[PDB]
Subunit: 197 residues, 10 copies
């Protein structure tokens, strides 16, 4: 309804200063050609659902890197606020050490480009975007503020799109690795339908 | 973020002819005031990922209705095509009898209002939307065509939003019924952060 | 009143997926240079007048190919719905095996280019267009939904336009093969009018 | 599909001077509310296909009036040119006495409103329009200049539209008085499909 | 007030089908390079003032041709209507054989370009135009419909313009061949004034 | 056809200072309600064709007034120049005493309203206009500068229009008082045609 | 407020037919490169203040030419009216023989370009303009109609602008030839101020 | 002819802070209704021609007030600069005591409204304007910067317009109190012309 | 000079969430009617010059309140980031306890309204604005990021504007309490200039 | 809110006539490349706060030049008024001899380019601007009219920007030469914060 994120088309480009391993570093979309990217926005540092999502994504970051997919969090908070939140104990509502970059969208350019800027507060909705190695947006997930996302589902979706990318088949509802796929044509698909019904 | 679909604001109204228990009947958003609605678009009848999703939601329809949530599927196919597909056995790629309405969007207005129309083909991306009892859009999920969605995740989101609605607390990442929630303010949130860290 | 179908001008170009002898094939207007084409739109698959027109033309398909004229049916339904209709028995309202191509206009682009889209329902009126070997539109016929067309009249018109194409004379009202024509000039035309009055 | 002439919409109103029984008279569409109307345009008086269509319709005018349908011919020629042509013997390419009004569209407004004006010559294509008693346009037929129309087909169409108006059924392809009709709902339509297959 | 006819500027170009010696011929202004032209519009064939003007100019056609001036009539009627009128006897209101071309302006282009189209009826006023051998318009005459023009005056004007073209003198009011003219400069004009007063 | 001068329409209104019987007085079109008006423009005072036209009309003014027609001359020159010219002997190129008003169009509003201004020189062409007692324009006559008009033809035109106004018949070509007129209908017009042919 | 005459800028070009020593001659502003020009407009020939101005400037013309300055009169009257006025004795309100050109601004362009056109009457206000040898406008004087200008003042101004052009000093109020001038800088200007106070 | 300053029209309104007898005071055009106003702009305080003009008017101020005319000087300089200049002795290029108001056009609105703003420098040309008791502009005078104006000519003009206002006669060239005037009509003006030629 | 911030006009209204005594509270300009306001923007929380400015103002907060002036700091950081910074010890680069509100401007509306937003970074320049008890903007101070402002100067300006507000005198350069003021008129100002020179 | 002066961007270029050492001279920003510039606007010559700021800056001019910083004064008054004020003794409200240039902004171009024009009066607010040697604007100070600026604070700001320019560190609040600075990165800034807290 706003912005430029469109399925099947190049994801909007972005550059931003991020906190990588306690240091500041420029992070641009072009750095991730050939790799999948899970880009997830969140409203505000030093809040409540926010740390649980960032922590949950950090702990399982390697599950995504095992598949060739980097995970990136982003909010309108500055890199100094990100760093401060990282230097805050998790017991205190902080993030602690982090295995994922934390981008600063202080110009709101990313949140506006991805159409997740809650304009009346100036903060980003819980928007999650899956971008493939070719730079093409494949999935959109936006939650209202009071409900956090699921890292299980984000992994399931990344796995799904990577599978159909290589093997030319499609993933049924609920597909997890090891589940049957469907050959997307009228004749070859009868194999699947007769087996599972 | 979808055509007229804006999280936090009223969901785009819709009125359509649907197949309901093997017969044609009008379906409107106004019929579900006071109830949650899970509205999922799908591209085409008589294809591949499509039947697995429609069957998955139909099989779980009553799990949603116990929570006061109604599941509605929709594509640009006519109600006559819907009925022919329902009268096709699942062993043949058909839908068999269904426990959820199947709306017809032949004018493509519903797809356009929800910003999910793959313009170059005239069909709807796998856009799923969660609306609460007050008619407010709470959740946007849109997949590219080759990957199905998750009924479990859709049910988790409905449950989470119904919980935050009732108890004024926010749901952490991966929340599921019985999991702990956070009191969203600086003082009362420490209860949660210290417990789980 | 809408579209680009103008008599005496090149027929609006079209490109579509069609079900040809049970399989999917691309169909272009350029494929039919030197041959006549009867392009007939119909509203919806799995309806009532629709199957009778498609079956009628399909049966008489060779009556047209003998004259070097291909017959093409089109609706906004997809090629998957077309095939499912072909695989339904005619006794149940289906098409059965088909001797003509059935094109899919899921983008509604053909129906808009030929100005036959019923905008309020998103379906095509019963529009029928006769195109000569040079790609020029020679005839327009559009019926409101409740009344089917006539295959006999369509054939009579194809025969009359090819005759005048070949001999430069003009066909009177009700002309059928073997009836007298008129030489279109003041002097020679009197041969006809003296005989027939 | 013709200028302001749109199927299912009110036919464009018109007012014109006509020759009626060898005399001049004003003719308006509103004069025929409650009756069906066949309005056929034609390019030029004192030409070749033109008299055969006008004569044919005149000869069969009473067959249409038995059905409550009035026939009207129109061209851009004036009423004085019409009258001189009526006063020319049919043996000599004239019209002789006529039993149908003959309207003069000297302003070309009727031809422009019904979208049949061949602009490069300023004359009307062979456009025929069937309008019901309610003033709603039900059928559009337009031929290129070389080929005349069929009065039998126009009569078949008036009959069919009057049958569907009164009974609420629909007319299959090729329907004539004495042919089976279809009841246009999924269940009742089966009566027809098993009888005729 | 309308059109492009301006004294002292190139007369609007025109090209039309015409009846010339009972046969159809294309006629265009560029055919008359170097010759004077009298172009007279008249409203309708088979009317009343019209034939008397057409006959009067046809009979005097050679009077104009001896001066290198070609006379052209034109109305919005078709060439076929012209020809049918030429083949009507003058005793019956016809034209009989003619010595001047009769142009057919079915597109109303000539009438519009020369600003003589009575819009509310689609017919030309009695506009007469005199054009010199260089293509420049010298005289405009337009009569309301109920009053015919004067061929004597048209000839007088052609004579006057040709005399002034050659000798650089100017023609007093009522001038005819043989009358005194004025040398248009202050000193030499006294010759005329002192003699004629 | 001139600026706002349209045949069959209310003549453009005008208001001017004029020289009348040697004195200045305001003249306006509303003064001549119920009387015919011959309004003739001329380019410039103290030139050559101009005085011959003005003097010719002044000498025959009473021939028009007997018919209830008032003749008015107009040029862009001022009333002071008009009066100096009236006071110049005719032997010297002057007008002498006048029997018609001479209007001063110093603002060029009359020439612009009547579409007779020669823009590259700021002077009026030899435009002549006949307005009936009802204020309607009946005749336009515009000559290029070198050739004067004919008072004879203007009187004939006034007589013709007055005759058609009173009797409802129409004046043929070259009609003069005493000539036969035509009753403008198909049947009654045969009296004239058979008589004169 | 209107036009293009701006002091300190190139005077607007002009080109007009004029009366010079009893004959018609073209006059352009470029004719006067290297000389001063006093261009004075006046409303109407054969009026009242006008002749006294034209005569005053004519009698004093040589006083201007001795200084290299040409005087030019202009009005919207034609050169023929000018000459007629020149050929009218002064005792009768005429100009008699003139020693200055009299330009004819019949198109009102000169009056428009110099912004002196009294629009509601189409005549020129009493605008006087002093152009220097380089074609630059140096002085503007415009009087309402009832009050004539001063030839003495115009001469004083020409003399003054020619003094400052040559010596680089500037002329005080009321400066006449022989009066003191001021050196335009702070220190040298004190020579003047101490002297005269 | 200056910005909004038009002869024969209401003078552009103005309001300004002015120095009046050593003190600051608002001065408006509406203060002078019923009185004549001489309003002269000048470029800059503490320059060279400027003081000679201001002193000349100040010294003659009462000669104008005896006629019911008030003299106002204006420049873009502030009222504090005006006072400083007044407090500067005349021997030093100052103004000394002043008998006329000095307006401060610091916003440059007066100079712009009167079309005398030399834009490239931001100062006013030597524009003098004469306004009658009705608020109507009667005279415009504008010199380039190097040449000063004439207080004698300004007084002559005021006397002349006041004279023509009272008596309805017009003032010839160079008129001064005591000189003959002309009765502005053709007949009465002869008195003046025969007397003076 | 700042977006909507203009000296001498009402200051841009603002409403924001601020940290006030360790808690969250709304702050709006209307709360400060009758009191002076020093509103100082700063780029980012957890940075370097920023805390020194906030601490310097916090330490002097009462010095402004004794003068009826409230100090307010604002950045684009959220109130949660503000509080985290407040709960960080000063020796660590934190703010520690504070005695001035810290407004959050995460919609950037305050910064944009006061024209201090560094657009390419999304953060506010070091803009300080002084607002009087009546809500009028009296002073603007904007520093590039590297250089901090001076609380002394801010206090001096508040004292100065309150003094001139009360006594209607003006404060010379460098004015501090005890220093002389000037009576702003020509006469009374001489007291000051003679004393101090 | 108006103009083009933006911190961090090239200062608006300017060029003006100025008074330097009692003589007129052109001053332009390009003349000060490599040097800091303090450009201070002031409303009006010969007023009250203004002379105290000009004299104060003139007295301290060398303190700025020892730093490589030039001071320029500018108002809308002309250079002739600037010089007159300089030649007025300070005891009388004058400026006396000066050691800084005084620019004349008679076209208001500089005041408009720097956004300090008080449009309603045509004078400049007390806007002060600090430009570094590269031409970049570093500081904006604007005071309402009744309160003068501080030459001490201006000198402080210049030193701070020159220090940060040279040493890359950043100046805390109240920094004066000799005080400690901050190293603007998270780690190195701790040096400062522990020492001073």
């Amino acid at each position: 309804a706003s912005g430029n994120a469109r399925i099947g088309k190049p994801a909007p480009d972005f550059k931003a200063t991020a906190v990588v391993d306690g240091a500041f570093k420029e992070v641009k979309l072009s750095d991730y050609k050939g790799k999948y990217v899970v880009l997830f926005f969140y409203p505000l540092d030093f809040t409540f659902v926010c740390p649980t999502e960032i922590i949950a994504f950090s702990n399982r970051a390697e599950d995504f890197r095992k598949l060739g997919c980097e995970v990136l969090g982003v909010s309108v908070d500055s890199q100094f606020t990100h760093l401060a939140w990282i230097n805050t104990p998790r017991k205190e509502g902080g993030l602690g050490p982090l295995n994922i970059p934390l981008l600063a969208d202080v110009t709101r350019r990313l949140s506006e480009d991805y159409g997740v800027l809650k304009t009346d507060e100036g903060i980003a909705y819980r928007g999650l975007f899956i971008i493939d190695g070719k730079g093409v947006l494949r999935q959109i997930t936006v939650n209202d503020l009071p409900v956090g996302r699921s890292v299980d589902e984000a992994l399931r979706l990344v796995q799904a799109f990577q599978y159909t990318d290589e093997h030319g088949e499609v993933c049924p509802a609920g597909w997890k690795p090891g589940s049957d796929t469907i050959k997307p044509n009228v004749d070859d698909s009868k194999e699947y339908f007769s087996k599972h019904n």
